[PDB]
Amino acid sequence: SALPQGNMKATATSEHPDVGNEGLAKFAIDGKENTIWHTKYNPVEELPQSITLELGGSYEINKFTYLPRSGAKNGNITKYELHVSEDGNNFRKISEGNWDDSGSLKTLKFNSTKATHVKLVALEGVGGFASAAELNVFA
Ligand SMILES: OC[C@H]1O[C@@H](O)[C@H](O)[C@@H](O)[C@H]1O
Ligand SMILES: [Ca+2]
Ligand code: NA
Ligand code: NA
């Protein structure tokens, strides 16, 4: 089941300031589909950029979901890696691939692994931005 988002802390390598529904990292874990993390723009901080969720404990995780922004496409992530850490500093890759640029929920299912942190790396995204409406981590 999804770990409680209110026990997590989101940080990112790049985040746009709060201009309403974007683009602070914490907007990716607020349970609100209208608010999004978005990489910093004006000017762009180029991809790759990433968002890390500190989980609020060390959990055996097996699924991750990425919900894109709704009603528009800038930052819809189309090439990704998923990494995990048990110390907040040293990361290891557990998933990688391509996603379509539609607003559909994107789900990753993987070998059970122990993590205190999960990092979603946007290698490519629509417009060269990365964005995320909601991220969930399942244990
Ligand atoms: O310049 C980048 C910006 O483009 C806007 O059109 C969009 O609504 C923002 O979310 C951001 O992607
Ligand atoms: Ca949100
Ligand atoms: Na343990
Ligand atoms: Na394997």
Say what the resolution is, in angstroms: 1.5
**CB of 44 shorter than 6 A to ligand 1:** no
Cα distance between residue 116 and residue 9, in whole Å: 11
The bound ligand whose nearest atom lies closest to the alpha carbon of 39 is 1
Residue with tokens 């490519």: 124
Torsion of CA 58, 95, 123, 88, to 10 degrees: 20
CATH superfamily of 1-139: Galactose-binding domain-like (2.60.120.260)
3-state secondary structure of 6: helix
How close are the terminal C-alpha atoms of the chain, in Å?
6
**CB of 38 shorter than 6 A to ligand 1:** yes
Q: How many CA atoms lie within 13 A of 32 on its CB side?
A: 13
